[PDB]
Amino acid sequence: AVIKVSEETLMYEVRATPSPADGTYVKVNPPRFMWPDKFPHLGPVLDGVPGQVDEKPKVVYRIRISQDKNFRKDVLTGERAWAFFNPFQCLAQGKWYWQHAYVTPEGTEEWSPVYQFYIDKDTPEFNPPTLEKVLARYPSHHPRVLLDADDWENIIAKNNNNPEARTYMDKASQCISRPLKHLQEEIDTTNVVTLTNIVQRESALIRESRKIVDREEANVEALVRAYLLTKDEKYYREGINRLSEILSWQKSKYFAGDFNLSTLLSMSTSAYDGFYNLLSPEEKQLLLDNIRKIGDKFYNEYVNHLENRIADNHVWQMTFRILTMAAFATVGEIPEASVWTDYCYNEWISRLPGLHKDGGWHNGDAYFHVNIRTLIEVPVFFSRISGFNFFADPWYNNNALYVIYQQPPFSKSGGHGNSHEGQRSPNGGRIGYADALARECNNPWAAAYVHEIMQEDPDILSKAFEAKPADLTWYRCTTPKERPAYSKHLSELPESKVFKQTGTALMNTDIGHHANNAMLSFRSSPYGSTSHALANQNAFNTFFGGKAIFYSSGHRTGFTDDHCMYAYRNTRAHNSILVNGMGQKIGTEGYGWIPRYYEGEEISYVVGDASNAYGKVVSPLWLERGRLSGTQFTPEKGWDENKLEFFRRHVVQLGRSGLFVVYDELAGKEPVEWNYLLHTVELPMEVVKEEGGLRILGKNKADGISIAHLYSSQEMTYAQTDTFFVAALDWKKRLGKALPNHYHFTATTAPCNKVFFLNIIDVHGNNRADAVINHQGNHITVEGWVIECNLDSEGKAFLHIENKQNGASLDFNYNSNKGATTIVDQVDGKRIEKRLVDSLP
Ligand SMILES: O=C(O)C1=C[C@H](O)[C@@H](OS(=O)(=O)O)[C@H](O[C@H]2[C@H](O)[C@@H](NS(=O)(=O)O)[C@@H](O)O[C@@H]2COS(=O)(=O)O)O1
Ligand SMILES: [Ca+2]
Ligand SMILES: [Ca+2]
């Protein structure tokens, strides 16, 4: 029942294995074929500072696919400049064989081993049309990307009475005859020049230049759309005026980072497609010169790189969509765009949207939003030009649940990924996204999220959020789809949701009534702590009424700076466990996973395994970032030789009571001191001895309470502090100072090879008084729950929880259950029994 994983990593920064995997049943027909590059390529390690980069040869691959193992009969073949292939047909049922080849510059083939896969009668079909079909019917007229010329007059008429459309003309009109100065006059470099660390200095230059570029992009895009909605050429004249000035900034020493360059490509695409029929020969050459130059630069960066990165952030967020639209804007007009369209259309189909197929966002709460326009605009565009529904990808309906559970109405987000602490309430961008999912997928839960939130806040779409990567106003101006009618209520959702592949879980007592909702989030993820993800495997957070109590601490001050590495990403910042003060490895190697779980009604359950997440940092990507950034991955900073053999954290939701039980199994290869952590981010914790353990009271500045009743198989000492491991200096801001302190509780055990912790957490607000924990009859009772467990370092772990009155129970043991967890639950008046065993992700 208990699976042990012995892998150095579960996910790879750079693809190491073929998909579909050897001997597997594919999850979709046709399969999406992908394989590692002949010359595996990590590429630049940072936006501002590339680091050591290898050559990336142009290459040719081949593929053959057949139910005939000797590849003689009915063989599908392909040749590509990149390591992915789409058959564009549904394959027959049964067993299949395939292999891919690298073709040397001399014409020699290096064939892979022959791999096998199976197609079932049950295998889902998701078969978008060939690019040849799409281009055959693609019109040569402009506009054809921002909208279609045939639909132009209708879109104008429909928006004459759309108050959302008025904002473009208002914003654009402010620009007219209002000169834009040159970059060097608009930019603020007064902070940049004070910085001596090159990663920080270059990062700040990126930030300062993007401030100006992004401000002006909003102007240029408003000018293009104002022209499309009115046909008043004053918007064309100023649009060309303003864009010409921005383009002239190209070669400035201040014009830094790839988003700025992609922004030039994007605006050039909008002005070219939108103003096409008005362009003078010089204006057209200007726009086309820049499309060619910048599109070629990004294609050359992506190819033999993007497709095999675990995820390439700036590309997935904005930059891929931007090449896609530039390619479809100019296909048939410039030769280069044939290659770009081929690449982008196939790469989307190959592996997008998303990384985790359960719908979770790998990079967490904040960065999800930076993908919103990409997640919607690309498949909307592909769908209308192809006549095929790209939203039939099951990821979208799965992602709808992530949107709701990860940040319920008017609620603090669950606490994952860089900048998680700033996500306090669903913003207009998130609402615009759920709105699109509701329309494109006819998803009643997404519809409920939008309807119930707009009921309380009618103006939410117009509130504050970063427009550049997330604003869907233009989508709303141009879609012929209406919002579906409100049907399901959020209150009809399951109390808990587990994302097994993402490695996260959300538990709620009242998700459909946010102000009364006691909530716990959990992470133990195969993605580890690379990219924007944190080193928080087996970490939980708690919330009441949509405000956090026990919560991951620290501030997002950068991407690789000392505060981030030592006090924010670092395991010491989170509600998890340290080993002799040492934390989880930075990178994909610091992974966790969720071996078993149960989403129920009277009881819910999730387990995280972080047994392999600790030790020395070995990720070549993060070792290079560390070298460049001045990071020290040393025992003094929190990383040392691994001592951890086993770490499972069992998390039990006690129905809708607001009570959660957290039970830990820990084993080390030698006696160690175990450090049990809790943090709060508004007010200090209050600690007192309680029976044979500790009571840790957390509270926020509002109604929120979370009380940990913590027991261990060993004697514990404790301490609290207000200080971060290193100051949260906001170095990115002019005269930036230290950001506000948080609060850090640590219980430390006597040295031992094995330890168990029981933590009964009481999460509530003004809805009820604290729960009373009774220590009677050599077990523990609370509100009709009886809780028994092993708190004996020399005994076998077990956890037995039962509410006789509600008919719920959970039994984890290594004796009669043989490592399994058995559940009894009541769902709609029916007794439900489950036996849970481990499964890999
Ligand atoms: O949009 C982002 O993903 C992002 C915005 C910023 O460029 C940067 O954040 S920061 O202000 O804290 O520096 C950060 O960019 C990363 C990016 O995510 C990385 N992509 S990855 O290789 O897939 O992980 C990579 O490009 O490095 C960037 C930072 O470069 S730096 O600014 O020179 O330090 O996140
Ligand atoms: Ca992201
Ligand atoms: Ca995270």
Author numbering: 24 to 864
Task: Quote the original article.
The structure of BIexoHep consists of three domains: an N-terminal small β-sheet domain (Ala24–Asn150) composed of a large loop and a five-stranded β-sheet (β1–β5), a central (α/α)5 barrel domain (Pro151–Glu515) containing 20 α-helices (α1–α20) to form an (α/α)5 incomplete toroid structure, and a C-terminal β-sandwich domain (Leu516–Pro864) containing 23 β-strands and 5 short α-helices that fold into a three-layered β-sheet sandwich structure (α21–α25 and β6–β28). Further structural studies have shown that the active center of the exolytic Hepase is an L-shaped semiopen tunnel with a positively charged entrance and a negatively charged exit, which precisely controls the sequential cleavage of highly negatively charged HP.
In the crystal structures, each asymmetric unit consists of one BIexoHep monomer, an unsaturated disaccharide (ΔUA2S1-4GlcNS6S) or tetrasaccharide (ΔUA1-4GlcNS6S1-4IdoA2S1-4GlcNS6S), and two Ca2+ ions that were confirmed by inductively coupled plasma-mass spectrometry (ICP-MS) analysis. Notably, the BIexoHep complex with the disaccharide product and the structure with the tetrasaccharide substrate do not show significant differences (the root-mean-square deviation (r.m.s.d.) between the two structures was 0.140 Å based on 786 atoms). According to the hydrogen-bonding networks, a series of residues, such as Asp70, Ser226, Arg230, Arg233, Arg332, Asn336, His337, Gln340, Tyr390, Ser554, His555, Arg579, Arg648, Lys755, and Arg757, participate in the binding of the disaccharide product (ΔUA2S1-4GlcNS6S) and the tetrasaccharide substrate (ΔUA1-4GlcNS6S1-4IdoA2S1-4GlcNS6S). The negatively charged residues Pro67, Asp70, Pro73, Asp281, Glu234, and Asp335 from the N-terminal small β-sheet and central (α/α)5 barrel domains compose the negatively charged section of the tunnel for quick delivery of the disaccharide product. The mutation of negatively charged Asp residues to uncharged Ala or Asn or positively charged His in the exit tunnel caused a dramatic decrease of enzyme activity, such as the enzyme activities of mutants BIexoHep-P67A, BIexoHep-D70N, BIexoHep-D281A, BIexoHep-D281N and BIexoHep-D281H are reduced by 90%, 98%, 70%, 68%, and 85%, respectively, compared with that of the WT-BIexoHep.
